[PDB]
Structure formats: structure tokens, C-alpha cells
Amino acid sequence: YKSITIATEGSYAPYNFKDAGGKLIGFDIDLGNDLCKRMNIECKFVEQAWDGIIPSLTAGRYDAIMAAMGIQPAREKVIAFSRPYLLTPMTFLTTADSPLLKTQVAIENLPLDNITPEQKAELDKFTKIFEGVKFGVQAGTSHEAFMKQMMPSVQISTYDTIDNVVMDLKAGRIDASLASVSFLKPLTDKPDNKDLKMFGPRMTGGLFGKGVGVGIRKEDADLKALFDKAIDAAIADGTVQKLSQQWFGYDASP
Ligand SMILES: C[C@@H](N[C@@H](CCCNC(=N)N)C(=O)O)C(=O)O
Numbered sequence: 001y002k003s004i005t006i007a008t009e010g011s012y013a014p015y016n017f018k019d020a021g022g023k024l025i026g027f028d029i030d031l032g033n034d035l036c037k038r039m040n041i042e043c044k045f046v047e048q049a050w051d052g053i054i055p056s057l058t059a060g061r062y063d064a065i066m067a068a069m070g071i072q073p074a075r076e077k078v079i080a081f082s083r084p085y086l087l088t089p090m091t092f093l094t095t096a097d098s099p100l101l102k103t104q105v106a107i108e109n110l111p112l113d114n115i116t117p118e119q120k121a122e123l124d125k126f127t128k129i130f131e132g133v134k135f136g137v138q139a140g141t142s143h144e145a146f147m148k149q150m151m152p153s154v155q156i157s158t159y160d161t162i163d164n165v166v167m168d169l170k171a172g173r174i175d176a177s178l179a180s181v182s183f184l185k186p187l188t189d190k191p192d193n194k195d196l197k198m199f200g201p202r203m204t205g206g207l208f209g210k211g212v213g214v215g216i217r218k219e220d221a222d223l224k225a226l227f228d229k230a231i232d233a234a235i236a237d238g239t240v241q242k243l244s245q246q247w248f249g250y251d252a253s254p
Contacts, residue, residue, distance in 0.1 A: 146208065
């Protein structure tokens with residue numbers, strides 16, 4: 001390899017978004033550039049809509065995906081992933097005045113690879129509390145997959161971008177959402193978003209998968225090995241921790 005093209009969405013701050021001049025910026029961009037430097041390969045970031053990001057990779061329109069993409073079982077059937085470059089649990093989001101905020105959380109950290117009867121009872125509690133609550137999620141995410149498979153009785157609306165989910169939640173068109181702590185903590189840390197709050201268990205595993213990784217075609221075994229070596233080195237020297245703190249305001253590095 002001499003040069004690679006990496007696709008990103010550009011609508012998922014602080015992973016990948018656009019600055020004042022319309023340039024692609026964020027954790028995924030800074031990390032992507034750092035990894036390519038370690039691999040001694042020219043880096044080119046391209047904007048690609050979330051809907052179609054995976055089929056455009058398999059069609060060979062670019063070499064990789066760095067777009068806050070979770071390493072999840074459904075995606076693993078289609079593409080390969082690098083080892084994770086960020087780890088994050090999932091949690092719920094609502095408004096600061098919502099009665100949903102008064103809900104008792106019996107299980108703070110909820111791993112879903114295996115669901116015990118106790119863990120199922122907690123999921124069932126939230127399901128019943130959410131019956132009548134209007135949820136919004138971004139389409140094609142593990143957030144959508146969770147709500148559709150784990151909480152099918154809950155009314156869900158799917159959106160093209162997470163920005164439109166947040167806009168509808170602020171306007172009161174939806175009552176709650178679901179996303180990672182890595183997305184929600186920087187969102188709610190903004191003084192702009194004092195009217196928004198995280199709540200509920202912090203979930204990991206199951207359909208959420210095992211970390212955020214670089215999406216690569218299954219046949220591109222060499223490129224995966226190059227990315228895995230670069231990620232191991234970027235984690236080891238504290239580069240991932242440094243970039244995580246810079247973009248997220250906390251350490252989400254593996
Ligand atoms: C890290 C991120 N992962 C989700 C949402 C990704 C949406 N990506 C994008 N809009 N560029 C997933 O893999 O489905 C999250 O849970 O918050």
C-alpha cells in the first residue's frame with residue numbers, strides 16, 4: 001500500500017463532523033491520519049452518507065471506514081474490522097425535566113453477551129417504563145437494532161442523522177433516544193445542552209458488539225494487519241488516550 005481512501009460520515013460529533021470551513025474533523029480524522037503515518041501510507045478522508053457506507057466499501061469505492069462504527073455481529077457478516085480503537089457503553093438520553101430521570105437503575109453496568117434473568121428483569125422494567133414514550137434513533141445503528149430486537153413494544157422513529165434525532169428531542173417531537181456514552185457525554189457536557197440528560201443502565205455487548213473499529217473488506221487481510229499493528233502502537237504510546245481526552249473530554253481508549 002502507498003495510499004488509502006477512508007470514508008467517514010461527517011455528522012457524528014466528536015468522532016466525525018465538519019468545521020466552520022466545511023472540512024472533515026474529529027477523533028476519527030485525527031486517529032485515521034495518525035494510524036496512516038505509522039503505516040507509512042498517504043491518507044485521504046472522503047465524505048459518505050451513513051446509509052450506504054458499508055455497500056460502498058464492499059463495492060470498492062474506498063479502502064476503509066472510520067465513522068464511529070461499532071464492531072457488531074450483523075456488520076461482521078459483511079465486512080472485517082480492525083481491533084477496537086475505542087470502547088464505550090450505551091445509555092439513554094432524555095430532557096432535563098423528564099419524569100424518566102426519576103427511574104431507579106438496579107443494574108448500573110449491564111453486559112448483554114449473555115442476558116441473565118436478573119438482567120432481563122431490568123431490560124423488561126425499562127421496556128414497560130418506555131411504553132408510551134416516543135423514541136428516536138439514527139437508522140442503521142446498533143441503537144436501532146437494540147430497540148427493534150430488545151424493546152419491540154416501544155414506539156421508535158428512525159432518522160438519517162443523529163443531528164436530526166437531537167433536534168427532534170430538543171423540539172419535543174420525540175421523548176428519548178439511545179446512543180453511546182462517547183457520543184452522549186460530550187453532547188450533554190455542552191452548556192448549550194443543559195436541557196438534555198443521560199439516564200438508565202450503561203449497556204455493553206450483545207447486539208452492540210465489542211468496540212469501535214476500522215471497517216475493512218474481508219479479502220483485505222494485509223490492510224487489517226497494518227491497521228491492527230498501528231492501533232496497538234497508538235494505544236501503547238498513549239496517542240488514543242490523548243485524542244480521546246481532546247475530543248470526548250474523557251478516556252475511552254481500550
Ligand atoms: C460509537 C457509536 N456507534 C454506533 C452509531 C454509529 C453512527 N455513526 C455515524 N453516524 N457516523 C453504531 O456503531 O451503530 C455509538 O454507539 O454512539
